[PDB]
Subunit: 127 residues, 4 copies
């Protein structure tokens, strides 16, 4: 499996599932951005989901400081490849990372052509 700008202890993991085929959503492009000082989105990390529909190694604990992050999932390209016309241009998830709460962030997203559900699982101690 590929990675990102941080194959180490994994503070941020992305998982994408397909609700039409009941499978991992493979080779979906994912871009991560950090909100900058000027209220702009700064490229942060990116990759393509693996065979298991996951993306790890996006970052390291050292680099993943408190701030606002955006995860963008290119859902439109995914459906087009399957020959299904989708509604959304992409799926976006925007959240604050706080040092206070748990330390590992899993963003899981379930895709259908006209709908998506996204959830966050935030946990401590490795897993």
């Amino acid at each position: 499996g590929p990675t990102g700008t941080g194959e180490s202890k994994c503070p941020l993991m992305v998982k994408v599932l397909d609700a039409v085929r009941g499978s991992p959503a493979i080779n979906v492009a994912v871009h991560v951005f950090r909100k900058a000082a000027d209220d702009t989105w700064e490229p942060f990390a990116s990759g393509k989901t693996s065979e298991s529909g996951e993306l790890h190694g996006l970052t390291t604990e050292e680099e993943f400081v408190e701030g606002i992050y955006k995860v963008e999932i290119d859902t439109k390209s995914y459906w087009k490849a399957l020959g299904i016309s989708p509604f959304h241009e992409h799926a976006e998830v925007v959240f604050t990372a706080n040092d206070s709460g748990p330390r590992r962030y899993t963003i899981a997203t379930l895709l259908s052509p006209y709908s998506y559900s996204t959830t966050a699982v935030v946990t401590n101690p490795k897993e």
Copy 2:
């Protein structure tokens, strides 16, 4: 104001949506059961969703006494008629109704071939 096997203030409404087509789920069979004194499921009401994906008139305030109800949605027939072999046999929703007085219940379900989401909206009579 009650009636008795029709539709009061419309105490029980079912709404079904299709996440693949981005439309109401039309002509979906719905069966409702009530838990009997003997712990068995007794037939309570049935119908099919309309062109708007809604099912009203299942019951009346008078007939819809306190109890445990099961709303069964025939999702399998729905997908097969579209040419898709789905994962689930049906979607079932089981809940206690009216145990603190009469309420109006909306059961909304979003359908995908390998996934479904169901939510309830409960309100306190009067308009």
Copy 3:
């Protein structure tokens, strides 16, 4: 039949539900943007959900031309007012509208503190 910054045949409706309370999400701020010629997001319409968790009258058929729209839902304010610190900053829905003629769009979103599901219902004008 069109108008121009009001509500046609009601081409754009937003509905927000609360999965924690089993009720409409009331007084939720919604902002809509349209992608400008210069690739920037231009303010298009705004409002707050009603007691039924709906927002109508954002636009008219005449004003709602072909384009890429972004519906931003202020979920964070909603949860904080309930005493809950949620995960997301907001929920955003991005879609191309009317690129094959005028359509009516319903954007329905179900909210949980760490999760949300969004679906679109698209219909072909006339009643």
Copy 4:
């Protein structure tokens, strides 16, 4: 972590998530049934979700033959423990296992007090 009536190659895995707390749903009771010849549900396996919100070792490949299965999740007890009043009595998932399709079944369910989403991921070659 506990198991069931089959800690071996894992043909059926259950995962439960909490949408209010953004965590694994721990110590949730799960009962699995197989539809018998008389149209009755036969106890098949059971357990409690682990710290990661998962249940493995429910069965073995030898025992998991084609047929209709029901997974019942005691969601009501889970919310009561948290001091939250829930809508549903439990969450039920009913599906056919077919030797034809993929061989590993993951049933993932996301819980809120008034809503749940369930999806199936069906895959081949181990993971």
